[PDB]
Amino acid sequence: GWKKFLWDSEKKEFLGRTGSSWFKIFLFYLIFYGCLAGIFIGTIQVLLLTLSDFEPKYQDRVAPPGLSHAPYAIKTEISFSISNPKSYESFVKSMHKLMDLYNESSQAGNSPFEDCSDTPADYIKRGDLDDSQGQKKACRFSRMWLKNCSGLDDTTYGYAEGKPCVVAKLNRIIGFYPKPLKNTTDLPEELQANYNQYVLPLRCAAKREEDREKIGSIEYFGLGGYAGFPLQYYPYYGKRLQKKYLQPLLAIQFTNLTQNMELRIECKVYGENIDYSEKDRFRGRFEVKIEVKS
Amino acid sequence: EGPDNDERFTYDYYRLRVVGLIVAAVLCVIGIIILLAGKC
Amino acid sequence: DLDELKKEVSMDDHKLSLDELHNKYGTDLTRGLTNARAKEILARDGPNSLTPPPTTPEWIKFCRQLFGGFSILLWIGAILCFLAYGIQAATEDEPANDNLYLGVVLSTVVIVTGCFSYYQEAKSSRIMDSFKNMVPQQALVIRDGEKSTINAEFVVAGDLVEVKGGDRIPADLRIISAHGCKVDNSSLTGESEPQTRSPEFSSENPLETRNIAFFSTNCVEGTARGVVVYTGDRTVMGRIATLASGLEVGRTPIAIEIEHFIHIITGVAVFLGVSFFILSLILGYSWLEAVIFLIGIIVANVPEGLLATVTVCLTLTAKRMARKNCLVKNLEAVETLGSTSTICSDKTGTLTQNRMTVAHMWFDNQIHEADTTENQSGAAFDKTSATWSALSRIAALCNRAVFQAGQDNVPILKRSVAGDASESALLKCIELCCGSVQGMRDRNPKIVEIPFNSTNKYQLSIHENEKSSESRYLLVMKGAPERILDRCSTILLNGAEEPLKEDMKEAFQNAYLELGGLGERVLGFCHFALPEDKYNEGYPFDADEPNFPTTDLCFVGLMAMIDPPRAAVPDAVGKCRSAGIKVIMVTGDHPITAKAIAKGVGIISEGNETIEDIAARLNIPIGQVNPRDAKACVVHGSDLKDLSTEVLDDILHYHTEIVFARTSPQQKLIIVEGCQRQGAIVAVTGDGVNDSPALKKADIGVAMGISGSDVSKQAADMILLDDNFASIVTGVEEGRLIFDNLKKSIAYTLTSNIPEITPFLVFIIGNVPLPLGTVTILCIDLGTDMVPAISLAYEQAESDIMKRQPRNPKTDKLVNERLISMAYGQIGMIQALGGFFSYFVILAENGFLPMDLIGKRVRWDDRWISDVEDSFGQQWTYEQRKIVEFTCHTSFFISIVVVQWADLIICKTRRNSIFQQGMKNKILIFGLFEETALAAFLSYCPGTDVALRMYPLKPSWWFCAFPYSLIIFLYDEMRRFIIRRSPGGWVEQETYY
Ligand SMILES: *[C@@H]1O[C@H](CO[C@@H]2O[C@@H](C)[C@@H](O)[C@@H](O)[C@@H]2O)[C@@H](O[C@@H]2O[C@H](CO)[C@@H](O[C@@H]3O[C@H](CO[C@H]4O[C@H](CO)[C@@H](O)[C@H](O)[C@@H]4O)[C@@H](O)[C@H](O[C@H]4O[C@H](CO)[C@@H](O)[C@H](O)[C@@H]4O)[C@@H]3O)[C@H](O)[C@H]2NC(C)=O)[C@H](O)[C@H]1NC(C)=O
Ligand SMILES: CCCCCCCC/C=C\CCCCCCCC(=O)OC[C@H](COP(=O)(O)OCC[N+](C)(C)C)OC(=O)CCCCCCC/C=C\CCCCCCCC
Ligand SMILES: CCCCCCCC/C=C\CCCCCCCC(=O)OC[C@H](COP(=O)(O)OCC[N+](C)(C)C)OC(=O)CCCCCCC/C=C\CCCCCCCC
Ligand SMILES: CCCCCCCC/C=C\CCCCCCCC(=O)OC[C@H](COP(=O)(O)OCC[N+](C)(C)C)OC(=O)CCCCCCC/C=C\CCCCCCCC
Ligand SMILES: CCCCCCCC/C=C\CCCCCCCC(=O)OC[C@H](COP(=O)(O)OCC[N+](C)(C)C)OC(=O)CCCCCCC/C=C\CCCCCCCC
Ligand SMILES: CCCCCCCC/C=C\CCCCCCCC(=O)OC[C@H](COP(=O)(O)OCC[N+](C)(C)C)OC(=O)CCCCCCC/C=C\CCCCCCCC
Ligand SMILES: CCCCCCCC/C=C\CCCCCCCC(=O)OC[C@H](COP(=O)(O)OCC[N+](C)(C)C)OC(=O)CCCCCCC/C=C\CCCCCCCC
Ligand SMILES: CCCCCCCC/C=C\CCCCCCCC(=O)OC[C@H](COP(=O)(O)OCC[N+](C)(C)C)OC(=O)CCCCCCC/C=C\CCCCCCCC
Ligand SMILES: CCCCCCCC/C=C\CCCCCCCC(=O)OC[C@H](COP(=O)(O)OCC[N+](C)(C)C)OC(=O)CCCCCCC/C=C\CCCCCCCC
Ligand SMILES: *[C@@H]1O[C@H](CO)[C@@H](O[C@@H]2O[C@H](CO)[C@@H](O)[C@H](O)[C@H]2NC(C)=O)[C@H](O)[C@H]1NC(C)=O
Ligand SMILES: CC(C)CCC[C@@H](C)[C@H]1CC[C@H]2[C@@H]3CC=C4C[C@@H](O)CC[C@]4(C)[C@H]3CC[C@]12C
């Protein structure tokens, strides 16, 4: 058994068959699998011929945009010691990775960058989603706009003396026009002052009623000095039609933060085509657990 | 179209679920019919 | 419980004297034992009652069903799942609970299967308990010189016991004085007729001598006395029952097939795991992760539903059998009949009816045959001549037996008749085609009768003649044909009378040898009209002197009789032989009768010949002929006792029609073992206790239900509640049909394996998002798939199953490499490709093109990256991309169902085409419809994306698996075509299961 079914010397068989058999089976499987591969490839090519290169056919799983930030928190918590420098390195490294893309050296010349209104403005339509006109042009976004959180002055961005920053960002969606709430009698409390129609407002607060008192002065930095996103940076025409495109950013400094205590801060954007979800905690709003333990 | 192109981001999943259920129900019935057709 | 001392043939102290017997056990031949001494012995060794069986608690046989070979594999699978969960819990934070769900599910599957199988075996046990009708019995013992009737449990060794015709022999007695006592030794020794018990000794074999009464036997006619020699379990049938209980059980063929099946499943499972373990270690992953990968691939290669599918499959075939009165105690004993290739049968009670019946009759120089079948379904014998009427008067009058009071309800053949078996057979035949004998008897008053004499060798009697025109006297007499022939001089031919010239005397001699050679017992009947002038109506013929003319009588005709076989016995034997099943007769009866019954039922085909037959046809000694020219052989038990192992092997290896006669139960067991030593499956069919050791050691025992003994009924595996022998043919047919169906269902549940594993393999090697989730694999293996696999059992035959030769056990298996090459190699591969196709389509329509999916799992899984760029530049949050992955799982599962449609259709038939067999199986159609309705329900019902994580699909996706399904159908169709046109070719020895 054990030895024979492995190698017999009368019938000159190996594992069961002769030399000419293993070849018949191997050749059959090679031809069979080859045909299988060619068929699968053909059915995938017709699929490539069914889709368009300038627009995703289905855009419903990304209708309400998200709200992400610059620091990379493992559990949406920012905890670091003001003494030990090797504590906030993971934060600054990320922050830097994000801002390193808005360098002026990158944004230069007429192409493909264009100087836009230094003050919030309206939408700008660079035509349809075609290849007729060449690569569209995107508005320039300077670093310096963000005043105390730019890594140009205090590389660390704040984390050095108990005053961290948080660069918020709106998720890029093709053909998405941000729309703000109108001036009518129904509008949140916060939003009444400084109603620049052209600005999408971002406002942070405390999750619990108690924490209000322990959170100090939320100082926002942005285009024009407002706490929002200028409507002029939209819409986004997609990578293929707008490579070298920069999305607006909003900096948030959490000055006067109580020491040695976990603070739950929820930031939220307001607008018509913006809706939140009780399941996705990053759809329109975001949560951060800051704790400057020193 | 233009600014108010809100329809480009909506899908009527409700009507789809309703129809898919009607169909599932029908297939289930037909099945039962075939199964008991002969024992009567 | 020494088995070798129980395997030995019975020994005894029969060859002794009445003085030696009384001197060995201690006992007064005329006064018996004393009550004080009787109680001293009763308490000294134990009551005369067999030991009850070894009770089996119900919790024990439940734990048995929870184990085995398949349930054990599922048990180890659950254990592995929990091990991997423990490792993930102690090594990583936020451990997914996928493994804990899969483990509790596997445990539940094993528990449910056990509950169902146990419930079935209990059902059979209850209907089995409704047959033991044990009524207490009391014996007649003589103590201190007085007769007393005491419970059977109080008889001891040494006291005197008296028996009377109609009672049961309590213990093993040593007859001391008898008065024409006869006993029925059919259950223990297998002797169809009543052997007379005489105080004298006659044969060296205790079973053949007449000075010993046995346990469980009954005294038919007469009274006798005897000293109890053996008592309690130490009796003959006690040692036989104890031996039966002390025998092993065995292991059916279906079980061995399931075992080798698990062997292959584990071979490929541990192979894929240890290999992808070394491969993962070669690509950078850590050990902690590789261990989980190994366990995951091993668990993924285990069929959770094949267990439930196989059990329900076998149960469905067991109810078809229960509908025709064939009950199986176990569940796998339903397949052993189909795999049998050598049936060892019993004669008395199994091959025959154990009831004497009038077979042939002689009259008007012509042999007439009578119907000897239970339900009376045959040919009449021409009841239009006067000769027959005179014969009916002779037999109906010169006969003293009468039906037992209160039988007005049972049929004419199954009623109780008080008397000898010959007068009973004659009474039944006359009452059958001549109406009520009670009026036939009161119509002619019996005047004087001279009982059968040992010297006269005849039974005669005179009665009045009911002719209202003839007041003469009628004289009738019956007896041995030779004696009666020497007392006649006339012959009633067609009514008139004629002389007894040598022409008819020779025709009578040839008729005598014709009925005699048929293994039947013949009797002669004659009558005469006494002249009323020499013997008036007033003269009384006292039985003292010659008042009747012994000679010058009128012979009317001979009447033979023998025990006939059951109705469907010849047809069933022929059907078994047609299927290539070797029929070997094994019985403890006289060879002169065994050979005749063998030739009459088909065991010894007409034309074949034995060595003695050749020596008789040539007129030469038997030591000269060559034994190779004889196809059939009659092996005597006495000769069987002195034979080596090789000799028995040669007996079965050179003789095709074998008949073992005068074989003891132990020898029966030896014969069964001699058949197994070679390598064939054996089925023993019997009824008495002598068959208990044969039914137990055989691969499958078949006990009779009405005519069977309680011991052989409890030691058998299959019971024939209707005593129909055709059920054996039905069983051998069903055993095959459900086998080809098990093969089809196994290939079905194994084809889905591949499109269920491949996703994870490409997940680790290619780093693409997870294609098939865990709750989907579960919704496939334990949901939709169950109904179709169960339906595959209802498939009819393709070719004649009762025509092909029995399957070879050493070469044709249940799960070979030809199946694995199809399910795991060709169909499963196409199904996996179809699933991946629907997958890529769903991700390409939402924005993730195939070029950007390779290399994303690290960020696609990360829970803190709320900005994942797709092929078009859009930013997707974590929950948004997860919703799409889940919708891809839902469509993958639906693709599986779509390809399963064509798989269930190509699995319906193994060789034949669909346009030939046909879609007449309503269950399969229902399976497809339900399989589709369930998938639509799981996707479209609200709250599923919350509970099970299955999102609705867009009507254009459901059509991504259709081309693959049609291709599967066309490929298998052309496959099942070259096999038909090219028999024995490459496609057959490579893809023919
Ligand atoms: C986008 O801008 C980044 C900053 O640009 C600077 O400021 C702008 C406004 C302009 O003025 C521009 O001209 C400036 O360079 C730019 O990143 C910068 O790249 C340089 C070149 O590698 C870095 O200089 C090196 O500094 C290290 C030590 O760095 C310390 O501080 C940083 C934080 O700033 C920490 O992350 C580090 O861990 C250290 O703690 C020096 O050791 C190193 O030495 C090298 O040069 C000297 C001569 O000076 C040689 O003798 C040595 O052998 C070495 O070769 C450099 O001096 C600079 O740190 C870095 N800035 C930051 C903030 O990281 C970025 O690359 C630009 N990206 C794009 C895509 O344009
Ligand atoms: C022998 C075995 C017989 C078995 C019979 C089984 C019975 C089949 C039972 C039902 C099937 C019919 C289903 C019809 C449903 C139509 C409902 C409908 O209104 O659906 C519209 C969708 C278009 O969706 P949308 O995304 O464009 O819009 C979405 C717009 N929103 C989401 C915004 C609202 O369309 C769809 O679902 C398309 C529906 C699919 C079209 C049916 C294709 C039939 C395929 C082969 C059969 C060919 C037979 C040939 C005859 C031979 C005779 C000898
Ligand atoms: C012998 C003869 C036998 C014959 C038997 C016939 C049986 C009857 C046959 C059919 C009955 C059809 C019933 C149709 C029910 C429609 C319900 C429906 O359309 O609900 C849709 C909405 C949910 O939409 P949404 O906005 O949350 O979508 C998610 C949107 N997002 C995720 C993007 C945010 O419902 C809601 O809100 C409220 C839902 C309330 C709960 C309704 C319960 C329905 C569940 C099961 C019934 C279906 C069984 C059919 C038979 C199948 C057999 C296998
Ligand atoms: C990310 C990528 C995805 C990867 C997915 C992988 C999915 C895995 C799919 C299938 C698993 C394949 C594993 C091997 C299966 C072999 C089946 C087997 O072991 O069944 C057992 C049979 C016994 O059968 P029986 O009972 O009838 O025997 C009766 C003998 N009596 C009667 C004479 C005594 O034993 C035999 O067949 C003898 C054993 C023969 C073993 C052959 C080994 C071939 C394996 C690999 C070859 C690769 C070479 C590639 C290079 C080609 C050159 C270019
Ligand atoms: C592009 C899409 C790709 C899809 C690929 C997957 C396809 C798989 C699904 C269906 C395949 C259907 C194949 C059609 C085969 C028809 C064969 C046929 O017709 O052979 C005729 C037979 C032979 O008769 P004979 O001469 O032996 O009679 C003798 C009578 N004596 C004895 C009285 C003389 O006649 C008979 O079988 C008796 C009559 C039986 C009539 C059956 C009709 C039902 C057929 C299919 C059910 C539909 C399932 C749909 C599943 C989807 C669920 C949503
Ligand atoms: C011959 C014999 C024929 C017999 C045929 C029997 C067929 C039976 C047919 C239908 C009955 C099915 C069960 C009905 C379930 C109703 C559930 C329901 O009406 O849910 C409505 C609400 C959804 O509300 P919402 O939209 O505001 O939620 C928003 C949530 N946000 C916003 C956080 C995402 O539910 C919730 O909230 C919580 C959801 C609770 C989940 C319950 C689902 C059960 C899960 C598995 C069992 C299925 C096993 C398959 C059995 C197959 C049998 C053939
Ligand atoms: C004859 C034909 C039969 C056809 C039937 C199909 C057979 C099905 C076979 C296998 C499927 C069973 C697998 C059980 C899956 C349980 C999943 C589970 O436990 O998930 C736990 C989830 C937690 O999720 P999370 O961490 O995301 O929550 C985060 C919540 N935050 C973030 C808001 C805090 O909790 C929840 O979903 C809460 C809701 C609990 C839902 C329980 C549903 C149980 C469904 C089936 C069990 C009964 C089946 C018996 C039928 C057998 C048929 C032979
Ligand atoms: C994209 C392309 C679509 C094409 C659609 C084409 C539809 C064609 C419609 C019907 C097909 C014609 C009907 C065939 C009737 C044949 C009747 C017959 O007498 O047959 C006998 C022969 C077998 O002879 P033998 O010598 O081996 O017997 C040996 C017997 N012994 C072993 C005892 C010696 O049978 C054979 O050749 C059967 C071999 C036939 C293999 C062709 C399979 C065609 C594929 C699909 C059919 C469509 C069904 C599904 C519908 C999908 C709807 C979307
Ligand atoms: C999306 C999924 C797509 C899947 C599509 C799969 C299509 C691929 C189908 C077949 C390709 C395999 C062809 C292999 C040919 C080389 C095999 C070979 O070297 O074979 C040698 C033998 C000749 O040796 P011998 O027997 O004389 O020696 C006797 C030796 N001793 C004793 C061992 C028997 O060859 C023979 O016997 C002749 C046997 C030839 C095999 C015929 C199998 C045909 C099966 C399917 C074709 C139908 C495709 C329908 C698709 C419709 C799409 C819409
Ligand atoms: C920042 O928070 C501090 C408290 O931590 C505020 O200063 C306190 O003011 C109270 C009077 O209301 C004094 O009793 C405390 O002694 C002060 N503490 C310190 C450390 O100065 C301060 O006003 C806050 N400043 C802003 C801009 O919010
Ligand atoms: C019936 C079977 C055997 C036919 C299989 C045909 C195979 C070989 C055909 C079908 C579709 C074909 C592909 C169709 C499109 C392209 C894109 C082009 O830029 C390179 C060639 C390539 C990649 C083709 C290679 C060959 C291909 C895969």
Ligand SMILES: CC(C)CCC[C@@H](C)[C@H]1CC[C@H]2[C@@H]3CC=C4C[C@@H](O)CC[C@]4(C)[C@H]3CC[C@]12C
């Ligand atoms: C015997 C063969 C040829 C029959 C094939 C029937 C196929 C085409 C049927 C079976 C089930 C059907 C699907 C059942 C449910 C739905 C959901 C509904 O909202 C749109 C139609 C859709 C998606 C159906 C399309 C057609 C479909 C896939």
Ligand SMILES: CC(C)CCC[C@@H](C)[C@H]1CC[C@H]2[C@@H]3CC=C4C[C@@H](O)CC[C@]4(C)[C@H]3CC[C@]12C
């Ligand atoms: C994902 C890809 C690369 C895996 C390809 C696996 C192929 C090569 C494997 C899958 C199933 C395998 C077959 C499974 C069963 C048998 C039967 C045996 O008697 C000879 C080997 C043979 C014929 C195997 C050859 C190799 C085989 C065809």
Ligand SMILES: [Mg+2]
């Ligand atoms: Mg018997």
Ligand SMILES: [Mg+2]
């Ligand atoms: Mg047994």
Ligand SMILES: [Mg+2]
């Ligand atoms: Mg599985």
